Every structure is written in C-alpha cells, then in structure tokens.
UniProtKB/Swiss-Prot annotation:
Made of a minimal module holding ketosynthase (KS), acyltransferase (AT), and C-terminal acyl carrier protein (C-ACP) domains, and additional N-terminal ACP (N-ACP) and C-terminal thioesterase-like domains. This is Polyketide synthase Pks13. Residues 7-85 form the Carrier domain. The modification O-(pantetheine 4'-phosphoryl)serine is found at residue 45. 4'-phosphopantetheine is transferred from CoA to specific serines of apo-Pks13 by PptT. It comes from Mycobacterium tuberculosis (strain ATCC 25618 / H37Rv). Disulfide bonds: none annotated. Identified as a drug target. Fatty acyl-AMP loading is inhibited by thiophene (TP) compounds, which kill Mycobacterium tuberculosis. Overexpression of wild-type Pks13 results in TP resistance, and overexpression of the F79S mutant confers high resistance. Structure-guided methods identified a highly potent and very safe lead compound, TAM16, a benzofuran class inhibitor that targets the thioesterase activity. The thioesterase-like domain is inhibited by coumestan derivatives that possess excellent anti-tuberculosis activity against both the drug-susceptible and drug-resistant Mtb strains. The chain holds residues 11 to 95 of 1733 of the full protein. Involved in the biosynthesis of mycolic acids. Forms, with FadD32, the initiation module of the mycolic condensation system. Synthesizes, in coupled reaction with FadD32, the biosynthetic precursors of mycolic acids, alpha-alkyl beta-ketoacids, via the condensation of two long chain fatty acid derivatives, a very long meromycoloyl-AMP and a shorter 2-carboxyacyl-CoA. The acyl chain of the acyl-AMP produced by FadD32 is specifically transferred onto the N-terminal ACP domain of Pks13, and then transferred onto the KS domain.
Length: 85
C-alpha cells in the first residue's frame, strides 16, 4: 500500500549515512565504506554529536550508545534504525 512504500527504507538510510559522512570528511559518498566501524571513518566527536542530532531529526530516534556500538557499521546501524529490534 502507498503508506507502506512511503516509509524511509534501509537503502535510503544507508545513503543518508554515506552522504553525511562524506560531507563531514570531504569524500565522495559512494566511496564511504559501510562495513568498517564508524569510529574509524574520520569523524570528530562534534561530528558524532551532529550526526546523532540529525538522525533524531530525520527519524525521531535518539540513538543510544548501546544500540550504536552494538551495530557499529553504517550498514548494520542503518538496518537497525529502520527495522528496530
């Protein structure tokens, strides 16, 4: 149904994260590795704070340390933000 197709998807969430990280570190979003720990991507601490705020504005999810470090890669984090437990 229309409202089901309407929801933010895992591919969209992955794309949003690659775009966010790419802008923050000055790299093409297509080049961002979705399989490495996000603490290895070159973000500053303030970048992490800003990205968390932006995720909250995009989805309403206030990302916990527990959830984030349990899904510490772009691809796993994106899946968990969208699909939940």
């Amino acid at each position: 149904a229309p409202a089901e197709r309407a929801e933010l998807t895992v591919p969209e969430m992955r794309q949003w994260l690659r775009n966010w990280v790419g802008k923050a570190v000055g790299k093409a979003p297509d080049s961002i590795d979705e399989s490495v720990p996000m603490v290895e991507l070159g973000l500053s601490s303030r970048d992490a704070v800003a990205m968390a705020a932006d995720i909250e504005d995009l989805t309403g999810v206030t990302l916990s340390v527990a959830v984030a470090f349990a899904h510490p890669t772009i691809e796993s984090l994106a899946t968990r933000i969208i699909e939940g437990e």
